């Protein structure tokens, strides 16, 4: 039951060819200089009776054809023979009131601007946080390597978001829809138009699995013993990058095989989107588990009365593990409607967009060791 | 470039492979320094924790698959302000006190190790050794604890911890008062970076637990969670 | 008896008076006419990495290329400083190594530390595998420094307030030098290897002759432990860095303080001291995580070497003077030129 | 060379009063922490009192917690211990002791048997 | 006994120290200054050797 | 995962607009 502009163009072409075949297949000329059968771009009204209210059923290719089945439109054939024209115009009279259609846009635009501002700020902060982390050779531990990988994943996610919401403008531009009206040389049929959104899905999955890697590494540092660095780092890189494609690639395969319409943009059926959504939820749940474990450990360490320290610790740990995604996680988009859907979308999009910035300024700017490194670099430069 | 081709492959690559092989072994072990006076009974601790596992003695013991190398300094002079700098990066320092005249020197020595520049961030595990001797002495009555330290006369039980074994309040009061002296010297300075873990004296599990706490605290500090 | 204290005090007063008579005027009035050295910039030509724990000592080979380094992880690593290529990586019996040495012939390499013994390893042997060749024992305190005279004998200084001259083949102590009250922290051998100096940790330095073996001269100018000592290139002077954040210069014939390298901003003491080829530059290591480059004559801290993330432990300039090496507590060796 | 020399103390009855002042030469007195040690007959060295860098933080043993007064005068380059309410068990040999390093609030080997920067000692007999 | 012998040997060492004449300090400073001026041209750290023959590029 | 849902929603919204625009363009002017 898929509906799209290209499909509607196809049904319009079929209707036009049916109408012309029917008109040219039989001679109707029972009239005498009366209204002559012709095909208007909307619908074709055949020969009727002069001075009569001729009625023709509205076409069947309209998107709301099922909504208004019996929306017959009149032509009002005149007695003299020619259809009456409009006021100071050459247009036969017709009634556009039966088969007619009668803001989410705003909300979406507000969300778009808020998350694009957040992603721009996060990208700007992270592109210099990575430079700070890589430039100083003193802070080249494996923890900083995982930090750098997480920063790169955030940067990739922001870049994919920019590319995808530019491709959305490309895919529904005026020229593209005019071409689809003419039925040739569109942008939807391109392979890159689907490659971009597949890359977007991969980047999102990589960001989530690098958050998972960060959480599991912190947990191993706290709970478990010390393992081999050169093996654990390779395993972590594998988990962060290669693992979030064992479900991305099957999603692309099933999208291409079954529903290759709309450049894999619209989740037409929720089952196919579950393929890429479920591992994200698994990673989020595991990260929340390690978050609560680390908070409990910090509580036990601090108790051996203060609460500002614990609040600061949990607030500075929220962005690193991405635990802001657990407040609205069981509210799936299947059952998210009304203002609840908008609230969930707003509080998830804004927080995800600003999560990169928060992590950058929490683990690269206010970090005490980084401040000490900047101070000693300044001291070294002062001597010159 | 062929003269330094094999001269690089055979030497540098193999040496780096060996260095990577033994670096994980070095990082997988915890180095402890054992300290104490000649009458502290630290050698008894060494034997007790070694049986089931010249200038310096090494005691390698492992508890639940974690390796510990404990270094006890022997055949050395009393002047130790110089070689103490070697143990800059030990995971912990074990201090053993013969809490049974003698306590002032031990307190001053622990104070000196507490405030040293090179031991500022290395925590100390305190062992108030010889608890049976302390109990017998305080129950005996001839030896007065309040004349070596007049502060004990106006002292009351900290009541934050309780003596599990059945014993009169006097031995508990003395045993916790000595610990209070040590902990007051400890907490007078040195806040945040390092702590002291006191235990009345198996010891292998105690050392393992305190090292685990030290490592967890350091890791949490690296994440600004503490 | 009980009257020896006053006689010794009178003898030391006579020594002080004889030293005072040997001084005519302040040194600053003689060297004020010399050209100031200017300002020195060094940059790390290459950093040698691979040590795990803090590097405690290191020694340049007789050739300006090879260089050995000792780290408290239990490793003795030989580097070819030209190409940053490791040549040997000798494991150590005891991980607490405080000193290391390079034989003048390059055949042997010595090490020692808290185990009170000196280990001599052979480099050029059959099959090209480094194996221990001698284990000299007999020192009571921790072995603080060791320097080769040749492939046959080595001089050591320990923390038991003693120095000794060994005999690698026999393994016994040919002679022992005593007189220091605190632990000896560093020794420096004269270019002629006929005399050497010991900077013990009693605010005193001593000069010994290895052939007979008694303290020829004793110098007492510092006010805390002496941590480093090194001979001037001509062998007629030596510089001692101490824990009072001061370096000082001594001349044997003058038997007096000559230079006092110090500054108000300097707080931490000196860890290592070395000279340059001409003796116009004194490089010193500090606990402030950086080295300083004084002038022997001007004495005004011409240069600063910064870039070590921890305490600077070992310093050394090659025999040809073409490079310097600094080993720090951050497990890093840095070559400067 | 460093030099610490302490004023002596004569024989006094129990409960008497004396004064032990030690003058220093060869180092910057104001830059060092100075302690007291005493050697009783048939006993080892025992630290008694100490003075901080600026002369503010002070500490005593339990035996002399409220009987002795510790002070230092930088201008006169001396350190004084005024003794009040003496006891027969205080008879010992007293040495002024110095921190081996400056700029630090703590140091070792002050009570060592062969420490370098220790005075000759005065025989205080009761 | 032992302390008396130690003091006697310390006094003997001090007297042996009090037996060598010390040259004027000005001479011992001028000699070091002359030595430094003698080897100034051969000191790579004093006069930075150029990269053509410097083995540490 | 909110970006995917927002992109899908926006896609159906824009598709409906474009379809509306197609009907209006087809209404007159060919």
mmCIF file of C-alpha atoms in Angstrom, chain A residues 69 156 160 199 201 274 314 336-337 349 364 374-375:
data_model
loop_
_atom_site.group_PDB
_atom_site.id
_atom_site.type_symbol
_atom_site.label_atom_id
_atom_site.label_comp_id
_atom_site.label_asym_id
_atom_site.label_seq_id
_atom_site.Cartn_x
_atom_site.Cartn_y
_atom_site.Cartn_z
ATOM 1 C CA UNK A 69 -14.915 7.898 -4.251
ATOM 2 C CA UNK A 156 31.286 10.988 11.416
ATOM 3 C CA UNK A 160 26.459 11.958 7.914
ATOM 4 C CA UNK A 199 26.280 5.548 5.465
ATOM 5 C CA UNK A 201 22.805 4.423 9.503
ATOM 6 C CA UNK A 274 14.047 -3.179 13.921
ATOM 7 C CA UNK A 314 26.918 11.365 37.693
ATOM 8 C CA UNK A 336 4.665 7.424 19.825
ATOM 9 C CA UNK A 337 1.893 9.766 18.671
ATOM 10 C CA UNK A 349 17.521 14.994 19.068
ATOM 11 C CA UNK A 364 39.249 17.454 26.629
ATOM 12 C CA UNK A 374 48.516 23.476 28.488
ATOM 13 C CA UNK A 375 50.004 25.284 31.495
#
